[model samples]
Target: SEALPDFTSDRYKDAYSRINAIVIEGEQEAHDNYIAIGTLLPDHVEELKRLAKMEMRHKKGFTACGKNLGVEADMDFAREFFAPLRDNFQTALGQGKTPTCLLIQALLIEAFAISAYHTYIPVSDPFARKITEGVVKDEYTHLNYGEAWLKANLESCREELLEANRENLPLIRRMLDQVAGDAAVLQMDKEDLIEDFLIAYQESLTEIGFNTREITRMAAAAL
Candidate 1:
């Protein structure tokens, strides 16, 4: 049998630079966003803080993942990569738009993280696979938190949720595409990751109380 794939190959390391950096920074953004959400929702502040704490932990773990392979993650690029989504989230928060905030962070980002992590697992080194497995499980908790919040306010929040999805889903789609080469180098197929993302995203929408018809309409934004 062939030897286990080398985690330190040049192509793999180069691809991993951006991939790992994005994950590290994304977790930080998730943490910050959750904290911002807590301000809008004082009653849930403690809970959200707990969620945010997990994100920091994820960031630290991913940082180590890169170190294990001698790869220095391009964190600055990842931060810039998230600019659009981060701006949207901050704008929503500033305007006291809970629905938009919830949809962006809780549902959309969490779904993306889950599916992306799922894809990474099969291709990742053993250490990263273990860390990602745990991270994926926590992300579901984050997604469910958003799903529960939105489901409770679905009637009042439906329009905003749909609007937010339209504006932001494309950004995510663009992100996946931009990183297509990086992912490919890491032995990941873009189409496969995109499909998994769609399923995760659509299912979260469904769980958030959208009808199949409404979910399909929102899902199209990614196309």
Candidate 2:
């Protein structure tokens, strides 16, 4: 195994910087998504609002941790990636009147983000590594929450979601292909992304004192 970077190494600086940027961008996106969810689904507003709050907290946590490590955040990629996708999804959903595609997009992104988190956690310095792991754990939950939310609402609008899925698959594949190896060590496959995500989601649930069988049952029913 490669040695972990020292706090002063450029890699350390870069990682902390990247985390900060991700948090900053994530905070804004979560805030925006929360607002959109409010307008789109008043009945689901409460949970969406709560998720926004959690994402804000996540941003704060990442920011605080980076600060403690004396590292600046670097967010160029995050800034560029979300807007176009958001705009496209907004236009598509506006015409179709289904939020399922939006949910799928979020799910896929969160899964990739979490995978990136895991890739970097081990390389972080001692002072910052725990923070990385903690935040990553939260990200896993965020990913799960996104998937679960999508699964629930998508199914409720089955035909719409199925149609949306059919409509979105091409778009999703295109986007994922663009981001295939953006993360340094975590090269990901587009087709297997959700399956791997579901596996991690299952494992994460069981790790946090959930019963694997029960959660799997619940998750399976969501599909």
Candidate 3:
């Protein structure tokens, strides 16, 4: 009943509470994971540090966007939501599995973020639209880094690469189901986002240097 009516409604803001916090927690964890990458790849500490800061900046932007809507993010819900992926990252990195980490963060999660943000930006408030647009561009940098990282190390970790994708790809679809209704409150169609994600994820397959049979095997897992 006032200015920015689309953004001010209760259902929309309530929904944004969860989705916005998802991004917030996602950024927060990504920052931490990128920092951990520094320890594993000692030479890239400074480079990864630069990358992590950008994610923290994303956290700040989304926090502000939440505040702009008079909404406080459900950070705890968001944190719980990401626990599976977060724990998986820790588990892989703990075993000194650099290739698995690259697959999860650089390609898997990065592609998801890129696709979801594109779906989100169109329906978001003006404030967040700009912020998300900037974030999308940054995701590509991370994408290409992982693209090269995994390609460079693929032969060494071939079995591990297939194993990680088989285990992790299924969760991507499940998480989307959890958020589907909330997303609709913001007018984002789940199927459309899935198609976008499929496109991005398939594009990732092409970038990873696997042959036809392996890509098909993993692609079945993804769908």
Q: Which has the greatest lDDT?
A: 1
Cα lDDT tens digits for candidate 3, 3-98: 233888788889999999998999998899889888789998998899899899988998999998899899999988888988899999999888
Clashing residue pairs found in predicted model 3: none
lDDT-best of 1 and 2: 1
Position 31, candidate 1: lDDT: 95
Clashes of each: 0, 2, 0
Q: Between candidates 2 and 3, which one is better according to lDDT?
A: 3
Deviating ranges (above 4 Å) for candidate 1: 1-5
TM agreement with the true structure for every prediction: 0.97, 0.63, 0.95
Kindly give the stretch of ten consecutive residues in candidate 2 with the minimal lDDT sum: 182-191
Which ranges of candidate 3 are over 4 A from the true structure?
A: 1-5
CA lDDT, candidate 1, residue 170: 95
lDDT of 2 by residue, 51-160 (tens): 67767776776677777777776667667655565665677556656455444445544555565556556655564567667666656555666555555554355455
lDDT of 3 at 112: 84
Candidate with best TM-score: 1
